[PDB]
Amino acid sequence: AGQLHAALDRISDRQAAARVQAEKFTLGEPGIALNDVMADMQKASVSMQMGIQVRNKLVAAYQEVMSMQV
Amino acid sequence: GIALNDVMADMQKASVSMQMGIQVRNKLVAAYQEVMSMQ
Amino acid sequence: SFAGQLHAALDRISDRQAAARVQAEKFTLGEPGIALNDVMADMQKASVSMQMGIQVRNKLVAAYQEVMSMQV
Amino acid sequence: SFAGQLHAALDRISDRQAAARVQAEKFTLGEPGIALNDVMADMQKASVSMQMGIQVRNKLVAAYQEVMSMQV
Amino acid sequence: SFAGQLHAALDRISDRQAAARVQAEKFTLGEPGIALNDVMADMQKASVSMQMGIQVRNKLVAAYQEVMSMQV
Amino acid sequence: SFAGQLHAALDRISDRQAAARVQAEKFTLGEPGIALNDVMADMQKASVSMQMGIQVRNKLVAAYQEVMSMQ
Amino acid sequence: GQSWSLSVQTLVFITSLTFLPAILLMMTSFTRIIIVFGLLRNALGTPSAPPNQVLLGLALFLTFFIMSPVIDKIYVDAYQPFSEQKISMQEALDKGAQPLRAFMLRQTREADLALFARLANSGPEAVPMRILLPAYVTSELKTAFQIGFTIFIPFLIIDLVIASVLVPPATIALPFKLMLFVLVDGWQLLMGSLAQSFYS
Amino acid sequence: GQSWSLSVQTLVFITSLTFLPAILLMMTSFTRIIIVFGLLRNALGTPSAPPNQVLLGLALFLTFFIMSPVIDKIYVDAYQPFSEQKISMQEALDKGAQPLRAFMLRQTREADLALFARLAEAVPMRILLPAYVTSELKTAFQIGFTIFIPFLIIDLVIASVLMALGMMMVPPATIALPFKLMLFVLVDGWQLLMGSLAQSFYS
Amino acid sequence: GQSWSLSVQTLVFITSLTFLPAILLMMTSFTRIIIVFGLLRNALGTPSAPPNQVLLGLALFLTFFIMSPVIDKIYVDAYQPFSEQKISMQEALDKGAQPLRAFMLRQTREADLALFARLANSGEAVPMRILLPAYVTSELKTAFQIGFTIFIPFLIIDLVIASVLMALGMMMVPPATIALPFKLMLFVLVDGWQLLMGSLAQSFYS
Amino acid sequence: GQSWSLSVQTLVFITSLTFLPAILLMMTSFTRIIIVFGLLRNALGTPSAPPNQVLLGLALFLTFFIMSPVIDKIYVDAYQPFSEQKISMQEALDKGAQPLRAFMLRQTREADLALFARLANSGPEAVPMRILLPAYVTSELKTAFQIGFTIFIPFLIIDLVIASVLMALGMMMVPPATIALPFKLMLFVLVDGWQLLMGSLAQSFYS
Amino acid sequence: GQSWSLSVQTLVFITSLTFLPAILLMMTSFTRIIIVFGLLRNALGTPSAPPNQVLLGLALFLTFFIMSPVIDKIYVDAYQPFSEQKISMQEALDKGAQPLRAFMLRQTREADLALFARLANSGPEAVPMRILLPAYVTSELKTAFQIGFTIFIPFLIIDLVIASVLMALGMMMVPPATIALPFKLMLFVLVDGWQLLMGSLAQSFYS
C-alpha cells in the first residue's frame, strides 16, 4: 500500500550509506578505519536480502489469491 | 527492536491463514454454485 | 465396516505425529535420553505418512466427485 | 511501434556481449592494452545484463500465457 | 516433409553425443591423442544440445496439447 | 496379453530395488566384497528406473483420463 | 479420549465440509421441497416459466428456516463445548450428530427401519447411521409424492371444470389458474402445511 | 513368488484409486440400477423430477447394501491375512479378486461368454468384463420394460376414457401425471421397487 | 551403423507416449465406432441412457479386440528383433509401423486419396502424410453410412406407432412416451448388443 | 548488417516457439476452417457427433496441405541462405516474413484495411505488420460466416420440407428432428459431403 | 532530490512486471471489450462459435490501438527523461501514472466515485488510488452491459419474428432457433458486421 514504499526507501538508504562510505575510503581518505565499512556493507546486504524475501512472500500470496476459482 | 524469526513466523502464520480462508471460501462458493444449478 | 476405517486411519496417522512432537519436546530441552537422528528420522516418516494420507484423500474425493457428476 | 524497441533492447544486449567477447579474444592473444581486471568486469556485466533480459522475457511470457488462458 | 527434418535433428544430436562418449572412452582407456580439454569440453556441448532438444520438445508438446484442447 | 507387461515391469523394478537394498545392508555390516563404488551406481540406476516407471504411469493415466472424458 | 493434531484436524474439517452438496444438504434438508416445486411447476402446464435460479434459492431459504431447531441446538451444545476444549473432534462430531439422528427418526415411516435393517442384515432403537439415511430419503420421496398429489388435485379439478364446457382449453385456462392461485395466495398455506407435515 | 518393495506397492496402490470409479462402479456393480432409474424417470413423463444427486446417492447406498457377501469374503480372506503381513500384495490381490469374479460369472448371460470367446469356470479377465457389461445391459433393459408397462397402461386407459368422454384437444399429460403419482405411491412404490431390485440382482 | 543414444531413445519414447494414445486411438482405429454408439443413443430417443463411461469403455474393449492381428504383427516383428537389441530403433520404427500402414491401406475409399494427391501436387506404398486424412474421411463416410441403417428400424417403429395412434382419433397425445417401451422391447428381444457389435465388427472385417 | 550472438538467438528462438504454433495458427492460416467445421457439425442437428479431437486434426492436416507454397517460399529464401551463413537472423526474419506477408495481403478485404489505417491514424505495397494482421483476422472471420451459411442452406431446406410433409399428412404431434436426422445423414453421404466440402473450401482458399 | 539504488530499482521494476496482467489489463484498460465480445457470442445463439484465443487476441490488438495516444504521452514523459538519467523513479512513477489517470477519469461516473467516497470518507480531480480504481471498475461494468443490451436487441427481434411466422403456419412443434441461426449469420454478414462493430465500439469508448 502506502508504507512498503518507506521500507524500500529505508533499504535504499541502508545500501547507499555503506556504498558512499566505501567509495570514500578507497579514494585516499583518513576518515574510515576499514572495519566500519565491512560490517556496514554486510548489514546492508542482509537487509536487502530480507527485503527481497518479503517481496517473494507477498508476490506468492497475491498470486495464490488471484489464481482462485471464485 | 523485534526478535529474530517472529517476523518470518508471523509472515508464515498470515500466509497459512490466507491459505485456509481461501480454501474454505473456494470450496464453499463452489458447492453453492453446484447446488444452485439444476432443473 | 468401512466408516470406522476413516477415523481409524485418522488417529493412526495422528498418533505418530503426537509421538514425534513429544520426542522433539523432550529433546529440545537438552535432556539426556533422546537421540537427534532418532527424531530427525521419525519426523520425516511422519511427513511421508501424511503425504500418503493426503494423496489417498485427493484420489478418493476426485473419484467421488467424478461419479456424482453424471446424468443418471 | 513495439517491435522497434524490442530490437533495440536485443541490440543493447548483443552489442555488449560482442564487445566483451572481442575484448577477451584480443586479450588472450597477448596484445598490449587490455587488462584482466577489465575483461573480468566486462564479462560479469554482460552476464548480468543477459540475466536481466531472460528474467524480463520469462515474466512477460508468463503474463501473456495467463492472459490468453482466461475464458471470455 | 517435417518428419525427415525431425529425424535429421535427432540424428545430429545423437551423433554429437555418441562422438563425445567415444572420445571419453578412447581417453580413459589410456590411448594417446586426447588431452582432457576435448572430452571435458564436449561433455558440456553435448549436454547443451540435449537441453535445447528437450526444451523444443516441451514447447512443441505444450503447443500441440493447447491446440488439440480447443473449445471447438 | 497386456497385464503381463505390467507384471514384467513392476517385478523388474522391485527386484532391482531389493537387490540394491540388500547389497547396501550387507555392506554396512562390513562383509568383505563391497567397495562403496558399486552401491552408489546401483542406487542411482534403481532411482532412474523408478523415475522412468512413474513417468510411464503418469503418461498412461493422463491418457486414459483424457479418453474417458469424450462424448 | 485424546484429540487429533492440528494438521489432521483441519484436514478432516475441509474433507467433511466437501461432503456439503449431496450427503449434507441434498439428502437431509430439502430433498422434499424441490421435488414438490418441480411437480407443481409442471402442474401449471408451464415448465420453467419461473426461472429455476430463484426457485432453488427460495427452497434453500425455506429449508434453512425449517431446520432451525436442530442446527441451533447443534451450535449451542457443540461449538461452546468445543471451545470449552473438554471435547475432542471425534466426540464432538458424534455428540453433535446425535440430534441429527433424532430428527431423522422424527421423519421416517412406521416400518422402514425394518426393511432397511434387514437389508443391512443385522439383528434388531440402537439403529446405526448407515441404516437411517437411505431409509430417510425413501420416506422423503414417499411423503413428497403425497403432498405433491395433494397440491395436484385442485388444479386438476379446475382444468376439468374449465374444459368440460365443450378450442384449446389449456391456453385459455392458464390465466384463470394463475388468477385463482394469486387470489388464494398458495405460497403461505403451502409453506404452512409443509412445515406442519415436516414436524408431523 | 517374491514380494514387491514399499515404493512399487504404494505406487500401484495409489494408482488403483484412479481406476476405482469406472472399474468398481460402472462395469462391475450397479450400472443396471442407474439405467433402471433413468428409464423409470423417463417413464413418469417428467425429466429430472427427483434430482440426479439423490438417485445416484441412493444407488451407491443400494450397491453397498447388495455387495455384502463379496466385500465380506474379500475383506476377511484377503485383508485379514494381509494386515498381519502373511501374504504378498501381488498374490493377495488375486486371492481377493477371485470371489468378485465368482460373483460376476453368476449375473452375466449363461451364453454370452461364448459370443466373446469366439471373438477373443475360470474364464480370463479380458473376456468376462465386456461379456458381463453387455449382459448386464441386456437385462437392465428387460427390467425397465416391465417397469414401463403399468404407466403405459395407465396412459392408454386414461386416453381411451377421455376420448369416450368426448374430448380430443386436451393433452392427457397434465390430466394423467397425478394418477400415475398417486398409484405409484399407493402401491408401496420405492419399497417394493428396491426389494425387487435386490431380489433379482441377489436371489 | 548409425543409431540413437539411450537418452534420446527414452526421450522419444516418453514423448510418443503423449501423442500415440490420444490420436492413435482417435484417428487410427475406432473413431468409426463411438460415432455409431452416439447415433444409436440418439436413435433410441433416450439421450445418455447408458452412461458415457460404460460406452467409452465398451468401445475401447471392442477396439482392443479388433486390433488383435495388427498388434500381434507389430509386437512380433518389432520387439522380437528389437527387445533384445538386434536392430536399430530408427529402423525398427518403420518395420513396426508397416502393418498399421497396411491395415489403413485396406480400409480406405480411393476418392479421398485422389483428392489429397491432386491437392499436394505429387506424382504404390503411399507416404505417411497423403494417407492419413484420406483414411479419416473414408472412415467418417462409412460411419454415417452405417448409422443411417441403424436409424432405419426405430424410425419405422416410430412412424407405425404414430400412424396407429392417429387412426384412433387421438391426435393430442405424445407419441414418444408410448414408443420408447416398444422400442426397448423390440431391441432386447432381438439380442440387441450381441448382434449390433457383431455386425459392426464383421463389417470392419471386410 | 550485424548478427546477434549465440546466447540471444537461441533465446528469441525458444521464446518464439511459445507463441508461433498457437497464435500463428489461430489467426494466421486456418481460422476459417474450424469455424466452418463447427457450423456444419451444428447444422447436422447432432452436436458432438464426431469427437472434438478428430476435427481438430483434419482441420490441421488441411492446413499443412494448403500451406505448401508459402512455407516453401519461406523455407528456401530463409533457411537456404541461413544454414550456410550468407545472411543474418535479424535479416532472415524479415526476408522470411515477406512472402507470408504478401499471401496475407492477398486475402484481406478492401475497406477493413483503410478502416484499420484510420484507427491507427497513419498516412498513405509497404503496409506494416502492426495494422495488417487484424485487418486479416477480420477479413477471415467475416468470410468464414458467409461460407458457413452457404453450407447451412440445404439442411434448412431439408428440415423445412420434411416438417411440411409431416404436417400436411395430419400428424401434428410428431417431433420433426427425430425423423429429419437420418435423412440429413443419408443425403450428406449420398453426395460425398466431406470430400466436396474440404475440396471446395481448399480451392476457394487457393483462389 | 534523492533516488534509489540500481538493485531496488530492478526489484520494483520486475515486481511491477509481475503485477502487470491483472493490475492493468483486467481493471484499467479494456475489460469492457471482452464483456462485449462475450455477450455478442451469446447473442448469436452459438456458444464458442469462434475460439476464445482469436477473440482474446483481437480484444488485445484493439486495446493497444485505443491506448496508443495515452501510452505515447506516458512513453515521452517517462522514458525520455529517464532514458538519459534526468528524473528518478520515485517521481517517474507519479509523472507517468498521472496522464493515465487523466484518461481513466472520464469513463468513471461521479456517482460511483461519491459512493466510494462515502466508503472511504475523503474530502473534496486529484482523487487518490484506493477510492478511484473501483470507481472505474464498477463504472465500466455498468456500461459494458448497457452496450451489450443494444447489441442483443436486433437478434432478439429476429428470433421473435421467425418464431411468430413459424407458429403462423401450424408447426408448433419444430424449434425456431435451428432455422434462426442461418438467418442470424446471414444478417450479421449482410451489414458489414465486424468492421462496423469494432469501429462503433472504439468511437463509443472515445467520446
UniProtKB/Swiss-Prot annotation, chain A:
Q: What is this protein called?
A: Flagellar hook-basal body complex protein FliE
Q: What is its main location?
A: other
- Record's superkingdom? Bacteria
* Keywords, sorted A to Z: Bacterial flagellum
Q: What is the annotated localization of this protein?
A: Bacterial flagellum basal body
One cellular component term from this protein's GO annotations in UniProt: bacterial-type flagellum basal body
Q: Which family does it belong to?
A: Belongs to the FliE family.
Q: Shown portion of the whole protein? A: 35 to 104 of 104
Please name the GO terms of the biological process aspect recorded for this protein, alphabetically: bacterial-type flagellum assembly; bacterial-type flagellum-dependent cell motility
Q: What molecular function terms (GO) are annotated for this protein?
A: cytoskeletal motor activity; structural molecule activity
Q: Give the originating organism.
A: Salmonella typhimurium (strain LT2 / SGSC1412 / ATCC 700720)
UniProtKB/Swiss-Prot annotation, chain H:
Q: Which key words tag this protein in UniProt? A: Bacterial flagellum, Bacterial flagellum biogenesis, Bacterial flagellum protein export, Cell inner membrane, Cell membrane, Membrane, Protein transport, Signal, Transmembrane, Transmembrane helix, Transport
Q: Supply one GO BP term.
A: protein secretion
Membrane-spanning residues: 11-31, 54-74, 143-163, 167-187
Gene Ontology CC terms: bacterial-type flagellum basal body; plasma membrane
What is this entry's stated membrane topology? Multi-pass membrane protein
What Pfam families does its record include? Answer: FliP
Instruction: Determine if Metal-binding is one of this entry's keywords.
Output: no
Q: Give yes or no: UniProt keyword Cell membrane.
A: yes
NCBIfam families from the xrefs?
A: fliP (TIGR01103), PRK12797.1 (NF009438)
Entry function: Plays a role in the flagellum-specific transport system.
* UniProt cross-references to PANTHER family, sorted A to Z: FLAGELLAR BIOSYNTHETIC PROTEIN FLIP (PTHR30587:SF0)
Q: What is this protein called?
A: Flagellar biosynthetic protein FliP
User: What is the organism of origin for this protein?
Assistant: Salmonella typhimurium (strain LT2 / SGSC1412 / ATCC 700720)
For this protein's source organism, the top of the classification is: Bacteria, Pseudomonadati, Pseudomonadota, Gammaproteobacteria, Enterobacterales
Gene giving rise to this polypeptide: fliP
